[PDB]
Amino acid sequence: MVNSFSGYLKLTDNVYIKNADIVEEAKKVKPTVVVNAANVYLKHGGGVAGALNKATNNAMQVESDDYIATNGPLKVGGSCVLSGHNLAKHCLHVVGPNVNKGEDIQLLKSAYENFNQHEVLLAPLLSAGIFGADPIHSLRVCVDTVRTNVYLAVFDKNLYDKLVSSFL
Numbered sequence: 256m257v258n259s260f261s262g263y264l265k266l267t268d269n270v271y272i273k274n275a276d277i278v279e280e281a282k283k284v285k286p287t288v289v290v291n292a293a294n295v296y297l298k299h300g301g302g303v304a305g306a307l308n309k310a311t312n313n314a315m316q317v318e319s320d321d322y323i324a325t326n327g328p329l330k331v332g333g334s335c336v337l338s339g340h341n342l343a344k345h346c347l348h349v350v351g352p353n354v355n356k357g358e359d360i361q362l363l364k365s366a367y368e369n370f371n372q373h374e375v376l377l378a379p380l381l382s383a384g385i386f387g388a389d390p391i392h393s394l395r396v397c398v399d400t401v402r403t404n405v406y407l408a409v410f411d412k413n414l415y416d417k418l419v420s421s422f423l
């Protein structure tokens with residue numbers, strides 16, 4: 256399919272990037288898959304997760320609570336596919352390592368591997384916020400791991416400007 260993603264800078268054959276709020280991109284484009292930067296409990300408190308969930312009027316959290324009650328916590332580096340509610344067809348919840356709490360940064364590669372199960376994704380930079388991974392490292396792992404088409408939404412202008420003039 257062809258989506259209405261617009262204004263993205265090309266990084267590689269398959270990776271694109273834009274200084275944008277992932278919630279606003281999802282609202283506008285209504286992609287097949289939006290990625291959430293989750294924790295293992297799917298407790299969507301802040302950052303991407305909290306913003307996505309708020310935009311679903313808490314439906315994402317209600318669904319997530321049932322998912323956890325049935326299946327238990329995700330693995331660090333793991334994922335699950337749930338509804339995208341009013342934002343997207345699906346939300347791929349992906350858990351990057353919480354480097355600030357001692358989790359192995361190498362699991363960020365495992366996290367991004369989940370993206371390869373989907374042809375097209377709108378996504379954030381996993382682990383680059385409250386989880387404490389260096390943002391340029393997360394971008395490099397994404398580029399070096401994801402082979403499917405990924406549209407990265409970077410909320411923070413200063414960060415975007417730095418990332419797009421860094422080597423990959």
Ligand SMILES: Nc1ncnc2c1ncn2[C@@H]1O[C@H](COP(=O)(O)OP(=O)(O)OC[C@H]2O[C@H](O)[C@H](O)[C@@H]2O)[C@@H](O)[C@H]1O
Binds near residue numbers: 302382383
């Ligand atoms: N609306 C947004 N749109 C795009 N990028 C955003 C947005 N908000 C933040 N970012 C950027 O997205 C990147 C990721 O920041 P984070 O969302 O913290 O994800 P993590 O993987 O580090 O932490 C996961 C925890 O965050 C939640 O609390 C979860 O519930 C988890 O507990 C950073 O570069 C942000 O600037």
